[PDB]
Every structure is written in C-alpha cells, then in structure tokens.
Symmetry: D2
C-alpha cells in the first residue's frame, strides 16, 4: 500500500519424480540452486540480502538448519540470517508471506523467500533409546508419518480428498477429467516452452559425468481417460473410493524461490518487478476436509485486496487431488480457463515444502507471458488450513 | 513504539532430563500444556487467538505439523492457524519475534508464541528407498545429525565451544567455576521457590497412575569444583580439550509459551502485562565460533532500544556451554550478578526448540519478582547465528 | 555295546537372565569357556580332539561359524574341525548324539560336544535389499521369528503349551504347583551346593574390572503359589489361558559341554567316565502339540536300551513350560521325585541351543552325587520333535 | 564297505543371481522343491524317509528350523525328524557325510540330505535390546557378518583368496584365464543340455502369473579375457590386488538334494544307484589361507578310498575364487580337463549352504553322462576347513 512489497525475480527447479532425476541431490543444494539464480536474475548481490526464509517440511537427516546451508551454498555470506518455516503444503507460500511482513514492518530490505523439498531423501524412522526387551519395532516412513497422515483422524490426505469428493459430489469421472486436463495442459505448456524462463537447471553428478536436468519429470504425456478409468482407487478400497494415482498429485523433489523488496527499493535499484503483492490470507478449517482450505483463504485475500473474484485473471490452486481442485472451482464458481492453465501438481508433482512457492513462480511467469494483471496463488494444508496470495503485475 | 507489543502471560513446563520425567510425553502435549496455561493466565479465550507460532527443531516422527496438534490440543479451535519455525536453538525466541512482526504490522491481534522439544523422543534415521545390494547401513541419530552437528565443518557444537574457549581464553577452571555457579544459583532459586510461578505442571500417565511433574529434573544439587575437575573432556580428546558434561548444557525435554498483543489491546481487556517488547535482533557469524552470536545480537538489540549495556538490569543468555557463556560475559564486560541469576541451561537443561522461549519466560518472571525494569534474552545458534530481545517491565 | 561311547567330563556355565549377567559375553566365549574346561577336567590335550560339535540356534550376528570360534578360543588347534547343528531346543543334545555316531562308526576318537546360546545378543532383522518405495518396514525380533514361533501355525511356543494344557488337562493350578516345586528344588540345590561341581565360572569384563560369574541368575527364591496365582496368562489372553511368565521357562544365556570317547579309549587313558551312553532317539510329532515330543522319544530310547521306565533312576525332561512337563509326567506315569529333582528351566532358564547339553550335564552330576545308575535326558522341540538319551553310570 | 551307502537320486534347483530369479522364493521352498523331486526320482515314498539333514548357513529370518519346514513342505510327514548343519561353504556336503554316518551305524535307513541358501533374502541386523542413549548404530549385513568375513582376521574371504594367490603365485592373468574357462565350459554345458537332467524347475508366483525357472541365471555368456582384464580388484585396492568380481564366485540362491540308503536297501527296492560313497574327509587349516582346505581333504579322502589321485576320473572342486581353484590344481598336479569340466561357481554361482551338495549333484550326473567311474567333490570352508568325498559309479 503506497510502497508495497514487490517480487523482482522468481525461479524454480524442475520437479523430479519420486526416486528420480533429483533424488541424489540434497535438498539444500536444490535450495542453493534457486537462491543463487533469483539473485542473479534480479542483479542483487548476495551480501545485500537481509535474510533468507524457506519452507521445508521433511527435514529429517538434512543436518542443522538446511535453509542456512542453502543460503551459504548460494554464495550468501555468513552474516545473513537464514531460517525455515513449516506449515505443511503451505510452507513455501508462507515463507513469502513472512518476507512480506518482515519487509513491510521495516526489519528487512531484501528477502529471498522460497521452499524446498527432497521427498526421495526422506528417511525411515526407528525409536531406539528405550530399547525393546522383546518384540518387533517399526521402521516408520517419515513421508507418511510427518508428511501425509492427518494427526487428528490418522488417515492419509487422500482419505480427506475422498471426504471432499463425497461432500462436494465430485465423481470418479469428474476427477479423471480434471486429471487428463491437467496432464494435457502441462504437455502443451512444455511443448510451447512456457516453463523455459522459470526453470533453472540443476547439476547432477553422475557416473557418466555431470549433467544438467532441465525438464519436469513427472508429466504423463498422452494421458487419456480410457487408461485412467481402469485404475483402482488407492486410498479407499471398500468399493466407494474414487482417488487413484492418476488423479492425485505425486510425491516429488524440487525447490523454488523469489526475491522481494519494497517498490521504492526496486525503483532505487532500477528494477522492474514481476508483480506487486496485494494481499494474503491464512485460515483454518476442519482437518477431515482440509482440501477446501483455499475457499475461505481465497475469499479473504480477494476481499482484502479490494477485488471481486471476477477481477482475478489467473489462479494457481495447488492440485493436491483432482477431487479437491474440482470442489474449489465448483464452490467458488471459477472459470476453468483461468485456473491452473499450465497444468498443476497432478502432472507436475508436489514437493511438499516447495509447492507453495513453485505455484507462485509459475503464476508470475504466466501473468507476464500472457500480459494479464491479477493473480491468485492458493494451497490447502494438512490438518485443516489454507493459504492464499493476491498479486498484480507491475 | 507508541503502541508496542506486550507480553501478558508467560509459562513453561519443567525441563526433563534425557530419557527422564517427560520422555513419554509427546512434544505436542508439552506444547498444549503451556498454550492452554498461558491463555488461562491471561484470561484470553482460545477462540480469540489470531494464530499460534512455535519453535520446534527435531520434528521427525512427530506427525503432521505438531504445532497445530499442540494448538488444537490446548482447546484452540480449528479456525486458528498454527505453524512452526526452525532456527535451531534460537527457534523458541524467533517464534516470539515473528509474533511481534505479525502483530506490529496489523495481521494478528493476539498470538500465542513459544517453543517445544522432546529430545528423548527424537528417532534414529535409515535411508531405505534405494536398497542396499550389499553392505552396512547406518541408523543415524537425528539429535546428532540434525540438532548438534555443524553442517559446514562436520563437528559437534561442543567443538565450536572449544574453538571459542581457545580464542577467548576461557580455561577449564574458568568453565567449571561458571558451571558450579550456574548449578548453585539454580539450586538456590529452587529452594526459594523462584520457579513456582512460571512452571506449569505436566500430567504423565504412569503404571502407578497419573502424576504431576513440577520440579526441574536436570539440576545437580551440591555441585562442586572438586568433582567437576575430575571429569575428562568429552568432545575433544587429544589432550587440549576443556568441555565436559558438567560444564555443558544437557539434552532435554520441555516447552514454554507467551501470550502477545498490542498494549492498546491489553488496555482494552484490562490486562496488566509482564513487559513490553522494546526491540529484537537476528545476526549471522562464522559457524566455527557460533557461540559468540549473542555478542553482535545483544549489541544491535540494545542499540535499537536506545539503551546502553549498563541500562540492562537482567540478562538471560542461554548457557549452551560454560566456555561460550564466559566468552560473551567477558567480551561484553557484563556484571555476572546481572547474568543468568537463577542459573542457566548447564543446570536447567536445553530442549533445543524450547529454550529461546524458556529463557524469556524466566527473564520476565525474574524482572517481576525483583522489581527490575530492563531485560535482555539472547541465544547462540548452530551454523553461526545469534538472536536477542529487549524487554521492559510494564 | 561292548565298546560303548562314554562321557568323561561335563560342565556348564551358569545360566544368565535375559539382558543380565552374561549379556555382554559373546556366545562363542561362553562356548570356549566350557570347551576349555571339560578338556581340563578330562585331562585331554586340545590337540587330541577329533572334532567339536555344538548346538546353536540363534546365530545371526555371531560371525562365521561361531562353533569354530569357540573351539579355537578354547585352545583347540586350527587342525581340528568344528561345526554346528540346529534342531531348535534339541540342538545341544543332538550335538552329543552326533558325536555318538561319529565315534561309534570310527570316524572320530574324541569329540567335544555341547551347546551354546546368547539370547540377549540376538539381533533384530530388517530386509533392505529390494528397497521400500513407500511404507513402514518391520524390525523383526530374531528370537520370536527364528526361535519361538511355530512355522506351521504362526503361534508362539506358549500357545502350543496351552494346546497341551487343554488336551492333557493340566490346570492353571497344576502348572503353578509344578513351577513352585521347580523353584524350590533349585533353591534347595543351590543352598546345598549341588551345582558347584558342574558350573565353570565365566569371566566378564566390567567397568569396575574383571569379575567371575558363578551363580545361576534366573531362580526366583521364595517362590510361592499365592504370588504366582495373581499373574495373568501371557500368551493366550481371551480368558481361557493358563501359561504365565512364572510357569514358563525364561529367555536366557549359557553354554554346556561334554567330552566323549569310546570306553576302550577312556580305559587306555586311565579315565573313569561319568557314564556310558546306552541309547538315544529322535522323533517327530504334530507341531501344535510339540511339547509332548519327549513321550515317544523317551519310550523309544528306553526300549532301545532294553529298559523299562521303572528302571530309570533320574530323568531330566526340559521344563519348557509347566503345562508340558506335567503332561509328560502324567502320560508316562513318572514319579515326580525322579524327575527334574534339582529343578528345571522354569527356575534355571532355557538358552535354546545350550539346554539339551545343559540338562545332560546336570543329569550326569546328579547320578554321580546320589550314586544312582540309570538316567534319561529329553527335550521337546519346536515344529514337533523330541529327543532323548539314556545314560548309565560308569 | 561290503554294504556301502549309495546315492540313488540327485537334483538341484537352478542357481539364481543375487536379487534375481529366485529372490522371492523362501529358502525352505527351494528345499521342498528338491526334496520332493529326489524322492519322486528315486520312487521312494515320503513316509519311508528316516530323517532329513540339510546344510544351511544364513538362517536369520527364516523361521523355526527351516529344514523341517522344507521337509514337511515336500510332503514328508511330521513323524520324520529334520534338522540342519552349518559348516559354512561345506554345509551341503557335510549334510551328506552326516547321512553316511547315520546310515552306516544303523540309525537311519533312508536319508534325504542336501543344502539350501537364499542369500537374496538374508537380512540386515540391528542390536536393539540395550538401547542407545545417543549415537549411530549399524544395520549390519548378515551376508558379510556371518557368511563372508573371517572371524579370526576380520577380513573378507576374498582377502584370504589374495593370500593364496600370493603364496601359490597365481597371477591376475592366471585367474582371469581360469574364470573365462569356467564361463565357457558352463556355456558349452548349457548349450549341450548337460544340466537338463539334474535341474528341477522352481515355481515362482509373479504378477503376470506362475512361471517355471529352469535355466541358471549367473553365467556370463561370451566371457573373454579382454573384458575381464579391464576390471579393478574388488577386495584389495592398494595396487597389489588380483581378485575381481569376474574371477570370484557370486552371491546366489539355490538348493540341492540327494537320496541315500545302503546298497542292500537299494537292491531290495530294485533301485540302481548313481554311485556308491567310498570315503569322505574333513580337515582344518589356517584361516588366512582357508581356500587350500581341499588339498589335505582330497589327499585324505583319496587315501581312505585306497586310490591314487590319478585314479580319480572327475573332480568338482568348488570355485570360490579362481585364485584358490588354480592353487589347488597346481599343488595337487591335477589335469584341468578332469576338474570342473561343466564349469564351476565363477559361472554358476555359490549359494553358501547349497554348494556342497550342488557340486555333488553335478559330479554324479557328469560321471553318469560320460560313463566314468571315480569322482571327488571338495570345498574350502571359511575359518580354515576343507571337506571332500569320493564316489564311484554304480
Ligand atoms: C499415490 C502414490 C502413493 C503413488 O502411488 P504409486 O503406487 O507409486 O503410483 P505409480 O506412479 O506407481 O502409479 C500407479 C499406477 O498408476 C498408473 N498411472 C499414474 N498416472 C497415470 C496416468 N496419468 N495415466 C495412466 N496411468 C497412470 C501408473 O502407470 C501405475 O500403473 P501400473 O500399476 O500398471 O504400473 C503417491 O503419488 C501419493 O501418495 N500421492 C499423494 C501425495 C500427497 O498426498 N500429497 C499431499 C497432498 S495434500
Ligand atoms: C555431553 C552429553 C553427551 C551428555 O553426555 P553423557 O555421557 O550422557 O553425560 P552424563 O549426564 O552421563 O554425565 C557424564 C558424567 O558427568 C558427570 N557429571 C555431569 N554433571 C555433573 C555435575 N554437575 N557434577 C559432577 N559430575 C557431573 C556424571 O555424573 C557422569 O559421571 P559418571 O561417568 O561417573 O556417571 C550431552 O549432555 C550433550 O551433548 N550436551 C550438549 C548439548 C548441545 O550441544 N546442545 C546445543 C548447544 S549449542
Ligand atoms: C514370558 C517371557 C516373554 C518373559 O516375559 P516378561 O514380560 O519379560 O516376564 P518377566 O520376567 O518380566 O516377569 C513378568 C512378571 O512375572 C513375574 N514373575 C515371573 N516369575 C515369577 C515367580 N517365580 N514368582 C512370582 N512372580 C514371577 C515377574 O515378577 C513380573 O512381575 P511384574 O509384572 O509385577 O514385574 C519369556 O520368559 C518367555 O517367552 N518364555 C518362554 C521361552 C520359550 O518359549 N522357550 C522355548 C520353549 S519351547
Ligand atoms: C564381488 C561381489 C561383491 C559382486 O560384486 P558386485 O559389485 O555386485 O559385482 P557385479 O556382478 O555388479 O559385477 C561388477 C562388474 O564386474 C563385471 N563382471 C562380472 N563378471 C564379469 C564377466 N564374466 N565378464 C565381464 N565383466 C564381468 C560386471 O559386468 C560389472 O561391471 P560394471 O561395473 O561395468 O557394471 C560378490 O560376487 C562376491 O562377494 N563374491 C564372493 C562371494 C564369496 O566370498 N563367497 C564365499 C567364498 S569362500
């Protein structure tokens, strides 16, 4: 307001498949890759960064404060504080919102915010300190334990998606249609080169030598409803299920970042931003239907912006599950041709801590490419939250 | 400033010994205990909380977003967002600073901030997804991997303490003197009932039934230099070492929380706060000497407050290691009778994510009890950071 | 027959409680202790041993061929072959029977046979070579998996004991009476010094220095039916159960050995044996009632010896469970004052691979002490086998 | 002698590659496959078996007495005892020798002996009962710990092979020549159908349905010295090494069995045996050079038979390593055209507990096919043993 926070640069790694192209890359190196790149793009020297704030969910085995490792590994000096936030799938967007606060209140001048996740490298967990006299002990999967199981109902996120499918009357067929659309949109965007600008290559050391990875790995080209219709429901297997691996997001690896500063600071520095941040919201809802978090979050953020829903040109609403995506669109009455137009996480994947920033990166570049003005990024969050941000092209 | 953020209530659990009195209590239940209690103390209804922000470091195996579990378990409704921050040992104080920002900028009205850690429940970690054809695989200790090993130099925090002992010329004898002083101060504070007000009991289900735990477990009463002088250095064993288990903080379990709002909101509600928050700082330093983080952090925060160091009545500077505590005091020229006067983490323990809020809780209650005005809380942070806050009794 | 196999010396370690006095002693060192000792007792030089044959059940993590480690560690030269047999609880007696065959057929002149088990050191097991994409994996307890669970019915040995209790009509009260009797007999034998001769001390390296362990650890002195009557059934918990920890054998650590040669060789060497081996048997029965294996085994061995059951002066029948012990006695019509007169495994413990030789050692020394002539040793075996041996004092 | 023990039938599974074609088949099912088949081949009813004796080394996680599981799973009644022997790589031949003793002394009439191993299914091991306060714990590979590491020198079997290569002056080039010869011989034998008779197919349940596996998986067709010459030494990496994966046996899965009875019993039953057993030996040597065990074992067995080495038509000497094979041949002065003429374990693989019987099976069928008379089977054994058997075609 008058001197709003603006986003000057925005980049992401490709999103790797589970146990795929980025699996050997430590999360902090994904982070360093995007941090160094957005600073390069913005022509901001690393010593001028006030702080680094990253979302990161599955941090077991990553060492002490992996965000600080990422910062230093990007060339940011030890003098610059760096820290993480966790708000499950909202984390990478929450990082951006935190930067908005720190800049807006006058504590920070330039913030690199983002998110990062290497789910392939998430470990299994054993509790060994008591010592089991006699009997089996579990090696628990941290992805399931800490990432994907609701704490209140002890059910997978996909069961919450089934809850939303039932309550919002999103059929199996509806879900597969949304999934095929997401796949086809991503394939089209890829062929057209729409992600070239946002992607920064990742260097991977291989037996055959160092290679660059610069194409998203998760999309299933030639996706079709006939093939999707044949799959069995994965999460709910009692004959009433609807969610399958083809209409759900994946488990994936990736990172994304943005450079933020006040408009006045961008002006001082001769930088034209991608967009100004208009508003943001965080909300709470019931855990059993966490997927609908974006409904109140978007409504609140749009209201705070002084907008109507019709004023929004482009939405990125994270595609946790087709059932959930469809419910949000249906309830809000959104035009599908304005929502996830480059495809979403069904096709692209969902590295938990990264996605909230990844979708913002894609949004900003879509607004830019299409010469549209107003955008919204929003995500649901396990345990019953939502987060949303309104941006306007500058 | 004019309408500053104020702290209305401040409470903590006891600090449990490693594999001790709180070992069976999930971290989120420690969190719920303090959250519910500070709201009770402040006479603030849980539905009036804007958000909950907690520090938490070792989150493996704790389930989806343990801070949200803690919030809901305290009686805060699902409508209230709850999330975590990680900045290693600074996390619990960072949570408070984040609340200052959210309130100060106008996003939140009332925040419950704090920190929590159950180190006893930290798991061991195994990477199982590739699958080892042939050979040994480690079960890595998450406390060592993620909590206590510097990422840049692959050394324990205690080696960084040895680095500081050498550079700031803090002898073995100096360190044991500081440690005995800390022990004796805590024992005196305990006997005098100085922690009664701040402590909230924890309920623990036992075979013999439910019991309340309301005394700190870690202090070693009757500590003396003769006994401490006999121990061997633990971290550096080549004959030049100085840090032992008796002059280092412990591995421990606990939680702490505070209720924050604007002065105007406290006034509206007829609440007299414990203190107003004057300033805070976060800084970066070299990882090899991370222990000295508080030197620049305190200097910056005190300067921001418009104070001189002599104006500060009481300091809580987390006692990660006696070597580090002594170095900070020596460099800054502080009066030991103004620093950690109820004892510190050598005696009381150091649950990573909780300590930054725990020391603030103890500080506020010391200012209150002694009728003193100005306080500073500060911590070092692994990877080379410092964080500090200035408060003034209201 | 004419030139029978004879046993010249017989010794055992104490039996350690689970995670108790012998828990830090590798199984092969228990073996070495008894092997070296029976050779000393027999005045047979280690280079004169033909081969070493030991029972051993739970060999995971013990290294390559632990019996060879035990042999060499006892001072037997590398020129002497050493190997193991596994027949679950029968293993230590089977080793002796194998020695009878090798000597009797003329392949070996002098054999050290025995059994050994360190159950405390049995590891947990994880299958890691495929690599689990996503999901929990068990750390399986090798004692349960490989030692104590029937392969055919996937039930604990204690469920087979319940099967026998039901079919042979051995009540809870009957079982506790047998258990108290076993405890009291062992306590009496201990007080009277009856085990002094057979026991060889084990050296254990301790922080406080090296100590000798020379008392059995498992007995519960002052055992009584009032206390036993209060315990709940452990294995079968649906209200029809009868087997509890107080009327079942333990999980334990120990080793035992014997030196065998032909009578003519003992005569040549001027050695008076403890006894001659008269006969032995191995049999199969239904796995669900494996505990009754000794009924056919004893009958067959006694028949092979040309004896009647009344001719047998002393029986050692391993006390896997009181239910099983009682069933054998009842079916065969044995005099309880001739069966397990020094107590049995309820009081003394049951290191799987050792027990078959341990009971033989105790039998031989009881015959000797009491100046009685004919003895039988017998055990049940998981999966439905029995093994028995008839001996006669020489 | 006069009424010798004879072998009536002899069969084996294919040998599967590590984590290959048999990896999903429990070891006991491999055992059942061969046991049922040799009884079928011999036209001996399962109820007429006296006992079953199998070699088996890596038994962790296989359940209670896997040999009894194999026996029952083959259709042998519960009345028939079944048990295992362990003498590392000698185990499967030791089982046969034990059967010779039991039959020869008159205890058993018909024995099914053999060996079995599923190395793919060998677990990793963790010691969890004490409980590690703080620090890493290993998941130890049972194959390395229990199978392949010498207990006396803490070195791999391949280091013992390097010891033998040095002492017996077997160069890298010598070793690769032996390895190529083994590969080529096996490839020739395969093409010619020489293993068709001995192999019994294994049924494997697959997603695509049940399939039969009937070809050995490990051979490397088209093996050549140019390719082998390029590989680096695997075990000894200081520049003096010679043993590589191409001149060493593999880690593998398989089982083998034989049916034994007296000649008089075969005559009674109208069965023509494959061969009579003439003699056998077991010996001990130094662990550092365990590979040379067969030298004294073969010499002793041949002497016991009343033979000269020139009288032996065909040798199977297990190819643990080319270095070791070559040393034995060189020292004994054997004709290579009489040794391992169908190839050996370099090409075929080495399932530890199975190999001692597997080579006997192959030997018997080679004698039969070629119409030759006298054979020797021999193996080295970790920890410094050797075992050998002389057979003569009947
Ligand atoms: C569902 C999940 C476990 C993946 O399961 P998986 O068994 O590895 O799934 P795969 O990728 O192997 O796919 C399974 C099948 O679906 C098929 N499939 C997936 N996408 C398809 C597509 N677009 N078209 C056709 N078939 C497809 C695969 O080909 C495979 O078929 P197959 O069995 O014949 O080989 C994982 O993606 C998941 O948990 N997603 C949700 C993550 C989550 O909850 N995030 C938080 C959101 S709040
Ligand atoms: C050092 C550490 C590993 C504990 O080690 P430990 O071996 O469990 O230490 P213990 O509590 O068993 O104490 C070890 C010995 O010191 C003795 N000791 C400890 N405190 C003592 C005291 N005040 N007076 C006398 N002796 C004391 C104990 O009695 C014990 O003696 P013992 O060997 O005779 O039994 C752990 O406390 C630690 O790592 N602390 C640092 C945590 C950290 O780095 N936090 C982050 C900071 S940046
Ligand atoms: C049963 C078993 C699991 C031990 O269980 P556990 O829970 O460790 O048993 P404990 O030794 O702790 O004893 C449990 C209780 O019984 C009590 N108890 C045991 N022996 C007793 C005795 N003689 N008098 C009174 N109480 C006794 C203990 O005091 C303990 O009481 P508590 O709960 O108040 O502390 C184990 O001994 C076992 O599995 N045995 C069978 C082994 C086997 O099957 N071998 C193969 C045979 S075929
Ligand atoms: C050596 C051992 C660890 C296998 O190691 P590994 O790394 O899995 O070996 P691989 O089968 O992957 O072969 C390694 C390389 O050798 C090559 N190689 C193996 N056999 C070859 C052949 N006949 N011709 C050409 N190359 C060959 C493989 O192609 C592979 O080449 P690559 O690196 O380019 O892919 C294992 O076989 C072993 O330990 N053997 C000994 C077992 C033992 O000691 N038994 C007890 C005896 S006392």
């Amino acid at each position: 307001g008058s001197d709003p926070v603006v986003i000057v640069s925005a980049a992401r790694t490709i999103i790797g498949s589970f146990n795929g192209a980025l699996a050997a890359v430590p999360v902090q190196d994904l982070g360093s890759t995007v941090i160094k790149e957005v600073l390069k793009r913005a022509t901001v020297a690393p010593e001028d960064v006030s702080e680094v704030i990253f979302g990161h969910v599955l941090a077991a085995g990553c060492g002490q404060n992996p965000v600080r490792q990422a910062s230093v590994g990007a060339g940011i000096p030890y003098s610059v504080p760096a820290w993480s936030c966790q708000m499950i799938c909202g984390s990478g967007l929450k990082a951006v919102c935190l930067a908005v606060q720190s800049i807006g209140i006058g504590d920070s001048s330039i913030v690199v915010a983002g998110g990062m996740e290497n789910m392939s490298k998430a470990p299994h967990l054993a509790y060994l300190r008591t010592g089991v006299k006699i009997g089996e002990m579990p090696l628990t999967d941290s992805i399931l334990c800490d990432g994907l199981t609701d704490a209140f109902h002890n059910c997978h996120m996909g069961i919450t998606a089934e809850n939303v499918a039932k309550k919002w009357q999103v059929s199996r067929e509806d879900q597969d249609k949304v999934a095929v659309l997401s796949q086809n949109r991503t394939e089209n965007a890829q062929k057209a080169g729409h992600f070239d600008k946002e992607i920064v290559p990742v260097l991977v050391s291989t037996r055959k030598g160092l290679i660059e990875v610069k194409t998203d790995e998760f999309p299933r080209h030639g996706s079709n409803i006939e093939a999707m219709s044949k799959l069995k429901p994965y999460f709910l297997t009692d004959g009433t299920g609807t969610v399958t691996p083809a209409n759900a997001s994946g488990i994936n690896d990736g990172a994304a970042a943005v450079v933020l500063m006040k408009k006045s600071e961008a002006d001082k520095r001769g930088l034209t931003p991608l967009a100004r941040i208009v508003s943001w919201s965080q909300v709470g809802v019931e855990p059993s239907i966490m997927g609908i978090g974006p409904i109140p979050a978007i409504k609140q953020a749009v209201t705070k912006a002084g907008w109507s829903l019709e004023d929004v040109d482009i939405f990125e609403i994270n595609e946790a599950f087709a059932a959930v995506s469809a419910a949000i669109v249906k309830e809000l009455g959104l035009n599908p041709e304005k929502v996830n137009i480059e495809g979403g996480a069904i096709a692209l994947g969902h590295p938990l801590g990264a996605s909230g920033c990844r979708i913002l990166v894609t949004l900003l570049h879509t607004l830019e490419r299409m010469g549209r003005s107003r955008g919204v990024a929003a995500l649901c969050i396990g345990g019953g939250m939502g987060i949303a941000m309104c941006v306007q092209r500058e």
